[PDB]
Amino acid sequence: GMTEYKLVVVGADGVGKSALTIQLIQNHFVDEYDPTIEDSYRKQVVIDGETCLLDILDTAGQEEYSAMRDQYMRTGEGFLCVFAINNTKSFEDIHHYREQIKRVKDSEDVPMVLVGNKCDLPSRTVDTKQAQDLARSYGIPFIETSAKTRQGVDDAFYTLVREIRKHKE
Amino acid sequence: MTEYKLVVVGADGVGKSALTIQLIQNHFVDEYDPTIEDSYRKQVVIDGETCLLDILDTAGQEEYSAMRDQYMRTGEGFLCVFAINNTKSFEDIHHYREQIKRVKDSEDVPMVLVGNKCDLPSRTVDTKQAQDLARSYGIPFIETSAKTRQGVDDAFYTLVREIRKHK
Numbered sequence: 069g070m071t072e073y074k075l076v077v078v079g080a081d082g083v084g085k086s087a088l089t090i091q092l093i094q095n096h097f098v099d100e101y102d103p104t105i106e107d108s109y110r111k112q113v114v115i116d117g118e119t120c121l122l123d124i125l126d127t128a129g130q131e132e133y134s135a136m137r138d139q140y141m142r143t144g145e146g147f148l149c150v151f152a153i154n155n156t157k158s159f160e161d162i163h164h165y166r167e168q169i170k171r172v173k174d175s176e177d178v179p180m181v182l183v184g185n186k187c188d189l190p191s192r193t194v195d196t197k198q199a200q201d202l203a204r205s206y207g208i209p210f211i212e213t214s215a216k217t218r219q220g221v222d223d224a225f226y227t228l229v230r231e232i233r234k235h236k237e
Numbered sequence: 238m239t240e241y242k243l244v245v246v247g248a249d250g251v252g253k254s255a256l257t258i259q260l261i262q263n264h265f266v267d268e269y270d271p272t273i274e275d276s277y278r279k280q281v282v283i284d285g286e287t288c289l290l291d292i293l294d295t296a297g298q299e300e301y302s303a304m305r306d307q308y309m310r311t312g313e314g315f316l317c318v319f320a321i322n323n324t325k326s327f328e329d330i331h332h333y334r335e336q337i338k339r340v341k342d343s344e345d346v347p348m349v350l351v352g353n354k355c356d357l358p359s360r361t362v363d364t365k366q367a368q369d370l371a372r373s374y375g376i377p378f379i380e381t382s383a384k385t386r387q388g389v390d391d392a393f394y395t396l397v398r399e400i401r402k403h404k
């Protein structure tokens with residue numbers, strides 16, 4: 069009936085990790101840029117008729133983290149790997165997050181969703197096709213999101229829960 | 238690429254148009270403008286599949302239901318919408334469900350029960366009562382808000398998944 073899920077939101081500086089989480093939890097867009105150290109949020113949601121208690125870890129994008137990172141990558145059940153569609157460097161950084169999660173988990177089969185955030189902006193530098201091809205090579209879903217409009221936000225989190233559910237079964 | 242014909246039904250002022258406009262245009266319509274009949278196309282990716290949604294936004298008023306049996310036969314899936322602060326709109330769900338089943342000549346019709354206006358603290362219809370009704374119908378129940386966009390994609394995507402299973 070009731071199941072807890074530990075979700076981890078990872079990605080480079082300013083991709084919108086906090087804004088995506090705050091949209092899901094508080095139903096509003098944060099226009100401010102306030103760097104995260106580490107925050108966690110709970111949310112009880114119904115996904116495919118099942119009562120899920122989400123425990124979401126919102127991580128720091130700030131580079132030079134071999135600190136606290138391995139522990140949450142070990143504890144986390146599923147990962148949202150976020151890049152911003154107008155930030156090519158954040159997309160190139162996905163390889164590093166994916167590889168480190170796989171290394172810490174000691175598995176090639178880790179519940180994960182590739183998230184292309186800021187899809188409300190007409191300043192795209194990363195094509196949907198290139199990100200779709202990367203997710204296909206990883207064997208993971210790819211979802212374009214906007215923390216501003218809330219487009220794809222529920223889809224990204226719910227898809228990740230569905231991926232965790234499949235892994236356990 | 239797959240086309241999906243979706244029909245949004247429900248009583249007067251439940252937010253059928255606002256839910257659709259939020260999905261198609263990513264904005265909330267504050268104004269109340271009664272619908273006669275409108276349709277919208279939207280290309281979306283659902284579970285890796287490119288879907289072309291053809292959404293029919295219907296009238297909540299009886300006066301504009303001349304196409305009702307025809308769109309209930311043509312429609313592949315139905316969003317049956319009530320407003321959580323309108324008990325009469327929840328009681329009206331029985332009529333929409335029964336007419337869809339009658340026109341389709343089947344008890345197995347892709348359908349999602351939608352409890353809209355969940356952003357309002359003026360609820361008159363409990364989540365449990367609506368969950369129990371959806372359970373008795375054997376259909377999913379999703380609470381939505383066209384204002385915040387909470388549950389909107391979940392409601393439309395769930396309906397596409399229900400159609401996909403039926404097919």
Ligand SMILES: O=C1N[C@H](c2c(CNCCCCCCNCc3[nH]c4ccccc4c3[C@H]3NC(=O)c4ccc(O)cc43)[nH]c3ccccc23)c2cc(O)ccc21
Binds near residue numbers: 071072124136139140
């Ligand atoms: O399933 C049920 N849960 C309910 C329940 C609760 C309430 N729980 C509320 C969550 C509170 C988490 C708050 C810290 N959670 C913070 C958090 N969220 C994360 C998400 C991903 C990864 C790590 C974390 C972490 C951190 N935890 C780590 O180990 C860690 C490592 C490195 C890091 O850097 C960060 C972290 N308490 C219970 C005690 C006994 C039995 C049941 C329960 C319950 C009641 C019930 O009637 C029936 C069923 C249930």
Ligand SMILES: Nc1nc2c(ncn2[C@@H]2O[C@H](COP(=O)(O)OP(=O)(O)CP(=O)(O)O)[C@@H](O)[C@H]2O)c(=O)[nH]1
Binds near residue numbers: 099
């Ligand atoms: N237009 C637009 N802006 C966004 C979106 N998501 C986040 N932003 C903006 O980007 C900036 C950074 O967002 P934030 O959510 O703090 O990113 P972050 O990845 O958590 C930053 P850190 O890694 O230091 O914790 C903010 O000004 C925020 O308003 C989006 O989907 N669209």
Ligand SMILES: Nc1nc2c(ncn2[C@@H]2O[C@H](COP(=O)(O)OP(=O)(O)CP(=O)(O)O)[C@@H](O)[C@H]2O)c(=O)[nH]1
Binds near residue numbers: 252253255268273296
């Ligand atoms: N607070 C809140 N208001 C809503 C929501 N959805 C619709 N409304 C409001 O309800 C009113 C009617 O919405 P509308 O989308 O026209 O409803 P409708 O069911 O299409 C009306 P008709 O049946 O005549 O076509 C509008 O004022 C609109 O702003 C919601 O989720 N939350």
Ligand SMILES: [Mg+2]
Binds near residue numbers: 087103126127
């Ligand atoms: Mg942050």
Ligand SMILES: [Mg+2]
Binds near residue numbers: 270272294296
């Ligand atoms: Mg209308």
